[PDB]
Structures are given as structure tokens and as C-alpha cells.
Design a protein around this ligand. Structure first.
Ligand SMILES: Nc1ncnc2c1ncn2[C@@H]1O[C@H](COP(=O)(O)OP(=O)(O)OP(O)(O)=S)[C@@H](O)[C@H]1O
Ligand SMILES: [Mg+2]
Lengths: 364, 273, 104, 574
């Protein structure tokens, strides 16, 4: 069922008219992430009982897969293998002549169409004007998150009818969340739950799926106090800290000794300009050699250049903590970059008993 | 650099100590064979050309078993060539392979199925420019992970330890030996590529020789613009039409001869010669 | 975030930007106000920026990956000031503080 | 034939004999047997130490699949111990295919750079677990089912490109009804990295849950306790090797396989070096079959000669002349050494049990630190021993009796041969605390003695630590610099003994060339360098000198000290 979705359904039903009637060649529907584009159109197609083929662009990452899946599903509605778009057109013309497919409109629903512009140059224009080429009462629908402005080819093509799905509001979200109430408690209880949850999280999280997931996760802790023995104040006081702890994470859901010194030296080399290096290390007044010199200066003990330190360097490179810049074949002048957050390096320096802030030129 | 061919007449110095050094090195062969045969791979590092010691070890101890020698210092060697050689002789297979990884899979499966096959590897100068690829060393380590393959390698480059990672270190299972032989790197520097002008200009027409001489003279004086060069060539009567001058310029270009990419000192020496 | 981006585009005339500057000036805005309820950490703002980039209102320059993270990446805005003002006028429940910050 | 243009050359034509002999054969057999036992025990411990997580994984998978009868996903933190993973992963699949599902497919990141290859490898391994696209996989699952789930293991996601990950997740989300799917993640770094790889639009489709694995330090302590501080193995190690292995482990890799390899190399070298290492009942019977040359070798031992010096002149003559008496006396000494090992291990374990509850841990927390500090010198001769005793003298009675209960558990477990009266007194119990402390101190003085103080220890100990250092931790740069600077150490030619840093003209061409290069600027002019080299070698001829200079320059360029530059003609950087 659909809630707070009555204008778009009525518009689509008026557009379709009767089965023997014709319609637009191309309709482009765009909206936000949680607008329910997939739900509404699929429920409408199931209700009207129309011959429709549902296709995911991501699943059909190759042209042959797309055409073969379309043809196979259409045949099942009524093995076939095709390779070129012209062959697909010819086979579609051959297959559409069924009695069940004689005086009825054929619908090809495509979702996640954002990748279609990266598949082939002429595939999208061909799909746009399918009804002219086939001349067989065919309609093609588009679902996407990007506006039509960026789907326009350079040469220009047959403009589809553009449609927008309205964004949700507080009342609509509350109604949708309160529809699927658990049967073991009163509807007003779940309504109050949804109300407090929205009052806490609506500022950031407007995603229906995410908010519903959060409600499902946190309901068991909501229902504990009454089990333990309609007390709004009692429930709110018992439940507030848990809600704050949950809001701490909305969207989120021990190195070796010398490795720490290597990491801190790499951070210093990356974020400190070379001109000041001696100013921080020379007792009197990035390339690999600079790193080695800085490491030798920092460590109070004399470290021998054993191969194990080079193995540590390569292991750190593999662990995606240090990024290699130069060519892989050039292993005599290699370049490196450090990608560690500053809080992490401060924590590791604290565990090492080292004060990195005293050496950071930018902070000084 | 042709003089190099005549430079081999210099006698060595202090050869007695080198003789005792080689005699001392010769005694480790049995221990090296024992360590290989138990599943360890050995790297030789040290100053001096160690090719002679490896050849002595081969001709002394490896004349009774299957063994493959790859002298990686040759700049034309690639890992695919080694794989093709192994497939064509060790397994006597001629069928081509769709990819390197498929060839590795076939070799691994064949050696795992046939436990009666033992192979020895003798690699010279593992630090070669063509063997420094990460996939190259990964392939070699995957090959050496088998218990039916024995690996002796040599290091002559300073930054060698950066080649091996922790996983690669585990796969290779290295043991090290210091063997400094002080031998000159004659053969290993021979194949490496670190006169032509005179030979080219000998059989060219004298007008082209004079034009090239004038171009060299102007270049040594201080690139020429086309108009000034054409006017000067007119003044010497070596050119009758700009089409002919452009034809001579294209002839010079075809031999990779406006700036001349030739050193000034070489031009000065060539002018008087 | 969009208002902060507009302020950056106004102060630095037609120059790119990254995540750190936007985060720093958003922190400045929330710290100048005494005790407003906008205490958010880095990861949530990072996710919001990722979503904004996903909607293709912001596009990278000279695309590359690995060498440069999502942070420290040169971003540009694909909107006009009058468009932002007109859209903000029709916003249902825009708070007073953010409106005045936008005007400032 | 080994010098042609083609670089590919190929040629076609008992284990114990390479070790040479009867003593060699026995040594090799003992080596193989001991290595077998050691690695078997290592595998036993490896399997044993993961049940508390394997059961959790099994129950989580059962709970997740119960709903099928949102993609379930388990996050497993495994640390930086890159060498361990594979072994653990082995046992991992040996659980799943044994308990819940016979479909386990582990995948690498190296072999899947593109999604096409990813799906190809996945379906290829699914084929023998019993164009390519998801419909084919669904059809295969339907055929094989006509309901076990499918298990996929991602080992190193750090090397995985993101795009294939998001594509696979978004594709698999829409076909969960068609066939179940569960992901297992292997993360070496902190779990936070998962937030930096998947955009939230993809992350929202996964129900991730977090597990954590065993720490490496506890693994090392358990291995050390089970394999060295026990009485089941006759081999023992001196302090130097223990310190060097501990340094390598704690400073380099936190890996246990490197330690095992070092131990195996130590055992191999020990059996290669000492002929007398042929030597509980096995040695008892082998003593009877001793040879005269081995008798003389025993007579030559330093500990043996000190012990002979200890005894009287008549006993000295009897030992130096008779053979059977020597055999019997060595047998008795070996039994005494065995008893010393037994009571040393028991006393050290009890002492660590006492020390474990001491605040601030004056002598360490784990077995290894106390063991090595006892091996270094006598503990009782150090003031730190007095500090430890006076800190022990401040314990509260309840914690004291808890410590005594733990010690009593140790006694009842494996203190079986000596001093049950100790446990009896512990049952009986400031004056009493002082008596207990003094008795413990007396035990420490009596039983904690270095093994080097006893004769015939060299049979079961190894001491060539520097060779182990040079064979495991190579220093190519140090060795190369030593060869370049002072070749006297390699040649013993008095002509090279002048100073340190001065210029021995008599030295070979490469050495003098390198030394001249060292003192010059950061950019080396080739003509000036050649002139200097000619001047040095001076103290037909010109061409020969130029030849030597060119050869030395080419050699140094090959070794990597030389990188040419085109900014200035004939110049090189370091
Ligand atoms: N108007 C609505 N009425 C009732 N349920 C809705 C409505 N909109 C969304 N839902 C529910 O929310 C769920 C998730 O919404 P989706 O259908 O995934 O949104 P979407 O617009 O299709 O975005 P995409 O394309 O899947 S990323 C649906 O499966 C429905 O159960
Ligand atoms: Mg959808």
C-alpha cells in the first residue's frame, strides 16, 4: 500500500488511459533518495496488471546482458540471444506480435539509470525513440536521482516528459512510520515513540529507511521500563541517555615499536616544509633520505639499517597508511605521502611519550 | 667507449689473497646444498663479481640434476620468457598460454600432481631493471613457495631489501651469506649500454657537408631561424631553391641529426678531423 | 554547508576549496553562537559532504584517486547566489539563526 | 655456454649424505623427530586458541540464517600480523565446512582487479566447492540446491578497489531472495576504515557486526610457556639468542612464525656444530655405545675440565685415564642436570605466580621478562631483589591468602616430587608473613642458579648468537661500507694500515675511487675526478689509468652510488 501518494498515482493512471490507447514514448521520473520511486511504480504496475519488464541498470553492466535479460523476461511474460542494438530492434519487433501483446502497451521500467550515460553514446538516444523505430505501442520509463539537465546528449534527442516526486514532511513521515505498528502494544504508544524519535533526529536524518532502522533497533530499550513496572515522564527520564548515546553515531552503525617512529617521521616529513627541517633537528645553527635522516635524529638509540626496517616500510605501504607517488620501477628515488589523521598521530605519540606539537612548524 | 675493448690488458693486483679467499669460499657448497634440500632459499651478497663462484658451484655439484640458469643482467629478459622456457623444456609442453597467471596455475598444478620433479634455479643479478616489477617478484616467490624447487639468488644493488614485503619474506624463506670476491664486473657491464657523424657525412654530398659545417659553426658561435639560415646558405651558393634546402633538412632529420642534439666538444673535435 | 560554501566563494573569488576549510568555518559559526544545538562530530559532516557530492551539486577538478583523499580535494559549487536565496525563501522550516547567517 | 645473448639457459643430466657419519645420522634423525614434535605442538596450540571466537561465529551465522528460513556481515579485526592470517583462516574454514556449510570461498585482492575477473574466480571456485553473470550463479545455486547458504571470505580489502565492492554489494542486495549471501571481512587496521571505503548509500544496505581476535602477545607467551619452559623437550637456549629473538619480535613484526624459523635454524646449527649433541632414556642407552674419539672430545669440554679441576688428584687421574668410569660419571651428571631443569622450571613458575599480583610489576608481567632477567645474572645479587622482597612484605592478608591459594593450585597441579610441606605450611597459614617471605627467599637462593654454572651444559645449549644475527638480520649497507672503507679487515695487508679516513694509495682502484668521491662535493665532475684518480695512482700510461678509472666509475654506477645528471655535463649525485 501507499500512503501520502495520491497525486502522482492519479496522474499516472490518467496518463495510461486504456490498454489499447497509446502514451508518451519516454517519461523521466526524478526525485530524492527516500521518495519511494521503486515502491510506488512497482505497486502501481502490479495493481493495474500490465505487461511490464523491470530492469536494473547496475545488474546489466554490459549491453548484451541488458538486451538478453529484456528479451528473456519479455518472452517469459508472453532461449534468445542477441548482440547488436539493430538485432535487438528486429527481435523485439518479431516477439511483440503475440496476441497478448497485440493491442497493449509494453512498459520497460529501468531503475538506477545514472550509469546509462556511461555505457554507450547512442544507446540512450535509441531507447528514447524506441516507439518510433518499433512502432508497436511501446513505452519506456526512467528512474534516477540526477536531474534531466545532465542526461542531455550533445546532439539533442526526443525530450521525455519530466516528472518529480514530492519530498516528505513531518506528518507524512509520522504516518508512514506509525502505519506498521507492532500488534503487541497500543497504536498511541508507537505514535508517541515516532513523535519523540522525530523530535530528536529530524534535524539531520530525514531518510525514511534509516529512521525506520533506528526505530527498529531502539524499540526494545523503549519498551523495557513498562515491563519492569502510560507514564510519559518516567519513560522519557529512563530513556533519554540511551537516545543521546545513539545519536552520538547517526550514520556510522597496536603497531610494532619502530613502526610508530616511522609513522611519526613520515607525518613530520609530509606536513613540515623542508626549509625548517634543520631548524627542528640540526643541533647547531618527500624523498626517502629525508625520512631516514629524520628517523635517525628522533630516535635516541642507534638503529642499524637492517632489512627489517625496509620490510616495515613496505608493509606500511601495503596497509594503505603511506601512499607511493613515483613509478613502481623507480625504487631508488621513491616518493611517499602520509594519510593519517592528526588525532591518530597525537594518540600514537602519547603512547610513545613524544610531543609532536613542539615540532609541527604550522602550529608554531 | 670503443676503447673499452682494448682496456682488458691491465693486470690484476694482489691475486694471492683472492686465491685464498676463493679457496675459503669453496668449502660452503655442502652446507648450501643441505640448506637448499630442506626447503630454504639462499641469497648471496657482497662486493665483487660472484658469477665465477656460482659457475664453480654449478660445475662442481649440479652436474647430476636438472637445473636452470637465468642471468638476469641481460636487459632483454622477462619473467614470461622464464615461464616459457620452463614450460617448453622442464615439462616439454608446446601449447601457448592465454595469460601469465594461467601459465602459473598450470605449472603449480602440474608440480603438485607430480611429486617426482625437482628443479634448481641459478639467478644472476636478481636486482635487474627488468626483474624489479612487483608482479615479477610475486611470481618468483609463488614459484619458490613449492617444496620441489630450490633457489639461489644474488644481490648487487644497494636498495635490494625494499623489494621484499612481509608476505614475500614469508614466501621466499630467505637465508643470507656474505661472500665478497672483489672480482671485476666485466661481463655484467659488457651487455649494458651506457664516429657515427663522420661515417654518415663521409658518403653524403659535399654541399650537404658544407651546409652542416656552417650550421655547426653558427651553433658553436652562440638556434637558427629558417629565414636567416636560408639567406646564409644563399650566400655560400650551396642552395638554389628553398625546396632543395628543405629536402636536405629532411634528409638530415631522417638520420636524427633549429638545434643540433650533438655535444659541442664532439663537434669541435670533428671539425678539425 | 551550502551557505558556508557560498561564503567561501564570496570571500575567495572563483577559487576551489576542500572539506577542511568548510569544516573550520562551520565550527567558527557554531562556536560564535553561545549554546546552539549543533554539536556534531567530524564523521557525520563528512557523510553529509559525501551525500552532497553524490547528488552532483559539487564536481571535482582534474579527477584522481589514491594520491588525494576525499579530504584535501579541490571542489567547486555549481549554483548561483540568487538561486540559493530563492530556494531558501521557500524553505519550510528554516531557523532564524541560519537565515541571518546566510544574510550576513 | 652461460654467456650467450639469450638469457634463458637450461640443462639436463640420499638426504643424510649432504650432512657429512653414524653420529651424523643419529643427529639428523633426532633433528627430524624434534622438529616434527615441535610443529605438531604449534599446530595444536593454534587450533586450541580460537574456539571462543569460532563458536561465536557459528552461532552468529546460525542466527543470521534463521531469519532467511539487509545483508548480514561480520567484521573481524586481525591486527598487523600479516603472516598469521592464512594459518588462522585455514582453521576458520575447517570449522564452517565441518559444522554449518560446505560452501566456503576465500578470495584475494591481487587476483581481482576488475569485477569480471572477480565473478569469474568466484564462480570457478564455487564450481569445485561442491560470459558469467549473476543469473548464471543463481541458476547454479538452484540446480545444486534442488538449504545451505554460501560463505565468502574477503582477506585483504585494503588492496581492493572500492568500485567493484560497491557494485557487488548493490547487485547482491537485489537478489537476496534468490539465494542467501553472507560476507566475512578481514580488516588489519581499526574497523573505522570501513566507513572510509563504502559510501553511505551502499553502507546502509549492510548489517555489520564486530568481532575481535586474539592478541599476539598472549599467543607468544603461551607458545613460550608450552614449548620452552616445559620439561618435554631436551633442547635449551642461552640468554643471548633469547634476547635477540625477543628484540626482533617486539621491534619488527609481532609475528610468531619468524620466531619459529629462528628456533629451527638454531636447532639445525646446534646439531651441525657439536658432535656431542647426539645425546632421556635414549641418551642413557647411547652412553654405552660411546667411542674413544668422543671420549676425548668429552675430556676437552671447558665445563668438564673445570669440574675435573674441582675434584681431587686421584679422581682427576681416574677420569683422565679410565673410560667406563667417565661414562658413569657423565651419566650421573646428566641426571643431575635433568633434576636441575625440573626444579628450576617449577620454582620459576611458582615465583612468577607470586610476582604476578605485585603492583607496578618491578620484575615484569609475563614469563619471558622474569626468565631472561634471571638468565642474565643472579637476581639475589641485585638491589632490585631487595626492593621486590620489601614490596612483597606489604601485602594485605586477604590478597596474600589469594596468592597462596593460586600457588597451592600450582603445587597440587604439577609440584609432585619435592616439598609438599610447603603446601602444608601454606594451608597452616606479620611474623607469619615474614617467615613465608624468608622461606621464599631461601628457595630463591637455593634453586635459582644459572645453568652455565653446571658442567656438561654445552650439550643442551647453543651460544653462536652473532652468526644467527648475521644469518637472519643482514646489514648489506654496513658490510658494503666496511668493505669500501677499510679493506685491511678482508686482506690483512700491512700496506693498508695507515689511519681511519686517510687515503691509502696502495688500495685497489675501486676503494680509492670511492674514498676520493666521499670527500668531494655533492656533484662530481668526471674530468676532475679522473685527474685526481690519476694523481693518486701516479704516486700509454694515461690510457691505462683512464681505463681503470672508467671501470671503477662503471662499477660504482652499477652498485647505485652513482646517478648521472644532465644539468651539468659529467656530473653525478649521491
Ligand atoms: N510513499 C510511501 N508509502 C509507503 N511506503 C513507502 C513510501 N515511500 C517509501 N516507502 C517505503 O520505504 C521503502 C524504501 O523506499 P525505496 O523504495 O527504496 O525508495 P526509492 O525512491 O526507491 O529509492 P531507491 O531508488 O531504492 S535508492 C520502500 O520499500 C517502502 O516500503
Ligand atoms: Mg528504489
Amino acid at each position: 500500500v501507499v500512503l501520502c501518494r495520491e497525486s502522482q498515482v492519479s496522474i499516472l493512471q490518467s496518463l495510461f488511459g486504456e490498454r489499447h490507447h497509446f502514451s508518451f514514448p519516454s517519461i523521466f521520473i526524478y526525485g530524492h533518495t527516500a521518495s519511494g520511486k521503486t515502491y510506488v511504480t512497482q505497486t502501481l504496475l502490479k495493481t493495474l496488471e500490465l505487461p511490464h519488464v523491470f530492469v536494473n541498470c547496475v545488474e546489466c553492466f554490459t549491453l548484451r546482458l541488458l538486451l538478453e535479460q529484456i528479451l528473456n523476461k519479455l518472452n517469459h511474460l508472453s532461449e534468445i540471444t542477441c548482440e547488436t542494438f539493430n538485432d535487438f530492434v528486429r527481435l523485439f519487433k518479431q516477439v511483440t506480435t503475440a496476441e497478448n501483446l497485440k493491442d497493449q502497451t509494453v512498459y520497460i521500467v529501468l531503475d538506477k539509470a545514472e550509469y546509462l550515460r556511461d555505457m554507450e553514446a547512442n544507446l540512450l538516444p535509441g531507447f528514447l525513440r524506441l516507439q518510433e523505430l518499433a512502432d508497436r505501442n511501446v513505452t519506456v520509463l526512467f528512474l534516477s536521482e540526477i536531474v534531466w539537465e545532465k542526461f542531455r546528449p550533445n546532439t539533442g534527442c526526443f525530450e521525455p516528459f519530466v516528472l518529480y516526486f514530492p519530498d516528505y514532511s513531518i506528518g507524512n513521515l509520522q504516518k508512514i512510520l506509525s502505519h506498521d505498528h507492532p500488534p503487541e502494544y497500543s497504536a498511541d504508544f508507537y505514535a508517541a515513540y515516532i513523535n519523540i524519535l522525530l523530535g530528536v533526529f529530524y534535524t539531520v536524518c530525514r531518510d525514511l529507511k534509516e529512521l525506520r532502522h533506528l526505530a527498529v533497533l531502539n524499540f526494545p530499550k523503549y519498551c523495557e521500563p513498562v515491563v519492569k513496572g502510560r507514564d510519559t515522564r518516567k519513560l522519557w527520564r529512563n530513556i533519554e541517555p540511551h537516545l543521546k548515546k545513539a545519536m552520538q553515531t547517526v550514520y556510522l552503525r597496536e603497531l610494532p615499536y619502530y613502526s610508530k617512529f616511522i609513522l611519526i617521521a613520515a607525518y613530520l616529513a609530509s606536513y613540515n616544509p623542508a626549509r625548517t627541517d634543520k631548524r627542528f633537528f640540526l643541533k647547531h645553527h618527500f624523498p626517502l633520505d629525508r625520512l631516514l635522516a629524520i628517523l635517525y635524529s628522533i630516535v635516541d638509540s642507534r638503529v642499524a639499517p637492517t632489512a627489517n626496517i625496509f620490510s616495515q616500510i613496505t608493509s606500511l605501504v601495503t596497509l594503505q597508511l603511506l601512499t607511493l607517488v613515483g613509478h613502481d620501477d623507480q625504487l631508488d628515488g621513491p616518493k611517499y605521502k602520509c594519510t593519517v589523521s592528526l588525532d591518530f598521530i597525537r594518540a600514537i605519540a602519547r603512547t610513545v611519550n613524544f610531543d609532536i606539537i613542539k615540532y609541527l612548524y604550522d602550529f608554531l | 667507449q670503443t676503447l673499452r675493448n682494448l682496456l682488458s690488458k691491465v693486470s690484476p693486483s694482489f691475486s694471492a689473497e683472492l686465491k685464498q679467499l676463493n679457496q675459503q669460499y669453496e668449502k660452503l657448497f655442502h652446507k648450501w646444498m643441505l640448506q637448499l634440500h630442506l626447503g630454504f632459499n639462499i641469497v648471496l651478497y657482497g662486493l665483487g663479481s660472484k658469477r665465477d663462484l656460482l659457475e664453480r658451484f654449478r660445475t662442481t655439484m649440479l652436474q647430476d640434476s636438472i637445473h636452470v640458469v637465468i642471468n638476469g643482467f641481460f636487459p632483454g629478459i622477462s619473467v614470461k620468457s622464464v615461464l616459457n622456457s620452463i614450460t617448453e623444456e622442464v615439462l616439454d609442453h608446446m601449447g601457448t598460454f592465454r595469460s601469465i597467471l594461467d601459465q602459473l596455475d598450470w605449472i603449480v598444478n602440474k608440480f603438485k600432481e607430480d611429486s617426482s620433479l625437482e628443479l634448481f634455479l641459478l639467478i644472476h643479478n636478481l636486482d635487474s631493471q627488468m626483474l624489479r616489477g612487483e608482479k615479477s617478484q610475486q611470481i618468483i616467490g609463488q614459484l619458490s613457495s613449492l617444496h620441489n624447487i630450490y633457489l639461489i639468488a644474488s644481490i648487487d644493488h644497494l636498495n635490494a631489501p625494499l623489494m621484499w614485503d612481509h608476505a614475500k619474506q614469508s614466501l621466499f624463506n630467505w637465508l643470507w651469506y656474505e661472500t665478497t670476491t672483489y672480482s671485476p664486473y666485466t661481463e655484467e657491464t659488457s651487455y649494458e649500454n651506457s664516429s657515427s657523424l663522420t661515417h654518415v657525412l663521409r658518403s653524403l654530398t659535399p654541399n650537404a657537408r658544407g651546409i652542416f659545417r656552417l650550421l655547426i659553426k653558427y651553433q658553436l658561435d652562440n638556434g637558427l631561424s629558417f629565414q636567416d639560415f636560408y639567406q646564409q646558405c644563399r650566400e655560400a651558393f650551396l642552395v638554389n631553391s628553398d625546396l632543395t634546402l628543405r629536402a636536405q633538412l629532411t634528409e638530415f632529420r631522417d638520420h636524427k641529426l633549429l638545434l643540433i642534439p650533438v655535444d659541442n666538444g664532439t663537434l669541435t673535435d670533428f671539425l678539425e678531423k | 554547508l551550502i551557505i558556508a560554501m557560498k561564503h567561501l566563494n564570496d570571500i575567495y573569488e572563483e577559487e576551489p576549496f576542500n572539506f577542511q576549510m568548510v569544516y573550520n568555518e562551520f565550527q567558527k559559526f557554531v562556536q560564535r553562537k553561545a549554546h546552539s544545538v549543533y554539536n556534531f562530530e567530524k564523521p557525520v559532516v563528512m557523510k553529509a559532504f559525501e551525500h552532497l557530492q553524490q547528488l552532483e551539486l559539487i564536481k571535482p577538478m582534474e579527477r584522481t584517486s589514491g594520491n588525494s583523499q576525499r579530504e584535501y580535494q579541490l571542489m567547486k559549487l555549481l549554483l548561483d547566489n540568487t538561486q540559493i536565496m530563492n530556494a531558501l525563501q521557500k524553505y519550510p522550516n528554516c531557523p532564524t539563526d541560519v537565515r541571518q547567517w546566510a544574510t550576513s | 655456454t652461460s654467456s650467450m645473448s639469450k638469457g634463458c639457459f637450461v640443462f639436463k643430466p640420499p638426504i643424510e649424505d649432504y650432512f657429512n657419519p653414524e653420529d651424523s645420522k643419529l643427529r639428523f634423525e633426532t633433528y627430524q623427530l624434534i622438529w616434527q614434535q615441535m610443529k605438531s605442538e604449534n599446530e595444536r596450540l593454534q587450533e586450541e586458541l580460537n574456539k571462543n571466537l569460532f563458536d561465536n561465529l557459528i552461532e552468529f551465522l546460525q542466527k543470521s540464517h534463521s531469519g532467511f528460513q539487509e545483508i548480514p556481515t561480520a567484521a573481524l579485526v586481525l591486527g598487523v600480523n600479516v603472516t598469521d592470517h592464512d594459518l588462522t583462516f585455514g582453521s576458520l574454514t575447517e570449522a564452517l565446512q565441518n559444522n554449518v556449510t560446505p560452501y566456503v570461498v576465500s578470495l584475494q585482492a591481487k587476483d581481482c582487479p576488475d569485477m569480471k575477473h572477480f565473478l569469474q574466480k568466484l564462480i570457478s571456485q564455487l564450481m569445485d566447492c561442491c560470459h558469467y553473470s549473476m543469473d548464471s550463479l543463481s541458476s547454479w545455486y538452484m540446480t545444486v540446491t534442488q538449504s545451505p547458504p554460501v560463505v565468502v571470505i574477503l582477506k585483504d580489502m585494503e588492496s581492493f578497489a572500492t568500485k567493484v565492492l560497491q557494485d557487488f554489494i548493490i547487485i547482491s542486495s537485489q537478489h537476496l531472495h534468490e539465494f542467501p549471501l553472507i560476507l566475512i571481512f578481514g580488516i588489519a587496521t581499526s574497523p573505522i576504515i570501513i566507513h572510509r571505503l563504502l559510501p553511505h548509500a551502499v553502507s546502509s544496505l549492510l548489517c555489520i557486526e564486530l568481532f575481535q581476535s586474539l592478541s599476539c602477545k598472549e599467543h607468544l607467551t603461551t607458545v613460550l610457556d608450552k614449548l620452552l619452559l616445559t620439561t618435554q623437550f631436551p633442547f635449551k637456549i642461552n640468554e643471548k639468542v633469547l634476547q635477540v629473538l625477543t628484540n626482533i619480535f617486539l621491534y619488527h613484526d609481532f609475528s610468531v612464525q619468524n620466531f619459529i624459523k629462528g628456533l629451527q635454524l638454531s636447532l639445525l646449527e646446534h646439531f651441525y656444530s657439536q658432535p656431542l649433541s647426539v645425546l632421556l632414556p635414549e641418551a642413557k642407552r647411547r652412553i654405552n655405545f660411546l667411542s674413544n674419539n668422543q671420549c676425548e672430545n668429552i675430556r676437552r669440554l671447558p665445563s668438564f675440565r673445570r669440574y675435573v679441576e674441582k675434584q681431587a688428584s686421584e679422581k682427576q687421574v681416574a677420569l683422565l685415564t679410565n673410560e667406563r668410569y667417565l661414562k658413569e660419571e657423565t651419566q650421573l651428571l646428566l641426571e643431575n642436570l635433568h633434576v636441575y631443569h625440573m626444579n628450576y622450571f617449577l620454582v620459576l613458575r611458582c615465583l612468577h605466580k607470586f610476582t604476578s599480583s605485585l603492583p607496578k610489576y618491578p620484575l615484569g608481567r609475563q614469563i619471558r621478562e622474569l626468565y631472561c632477567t634471571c638468565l642474565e645474572k643472579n637476581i639475589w645479587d641485585s638491589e632490585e631483589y631487595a626492593s621486590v622482597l620489601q614490596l612483597l612484605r606489604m601485602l594485605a592478608k586477604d590478597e596474600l591468602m589469594t596468592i597462596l591459594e593460586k600457588c597451592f593450585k600450582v603445587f597440587k597441579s604439577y609440584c609432585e616430587n619435592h616439598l609438599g610441606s610447603t603446601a602444608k605450611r601454606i594451608e597452616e597459614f606479620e611474623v607469619l608473613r615474614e617467615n613465608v617471605v624468608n622461606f621464599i627467599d631461601c628457595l630463591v637462593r637455593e634453586y635459582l642458579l644459572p645453568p652455565e654454572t653446571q658442567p656438561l651444559h654445552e650439550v643442551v645449549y647453543f651460544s653462536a648468537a652473532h652468526a644467527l644475527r648475521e644469518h637472519l638480520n643482514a646489514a648489506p649497507r654496513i658490510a658494503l661500507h666496511t668493505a669500501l672503507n677499510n679493506p685491511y679487515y678482508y686482506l690483512k695487508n700491512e700496506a693498508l694500515k695507515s689511519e681511519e679516513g686517510c687515503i691509502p694509495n696502495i688500495a685497489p682502484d675501486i676503494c680509492i675511487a670511492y674514498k676520493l668521491h666521499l670527500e668531494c662535493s655533492r656533484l662530481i665532475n668526471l674530468v676532475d675526478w679522473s685527474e685526481a684518480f690519476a694523481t693518486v695512482v701516479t704516486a700509454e700510461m694515461n690510457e691505462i689509468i683512464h681505463a681503470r678509472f672508467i671501470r671503477a666509475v662503471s662499477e660504482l654506477e652499477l652498485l647505485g652510488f652513482i646517478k648521472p645528471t644532465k644539468q651539468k655535463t659529467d656530473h653525478v649525485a649521491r
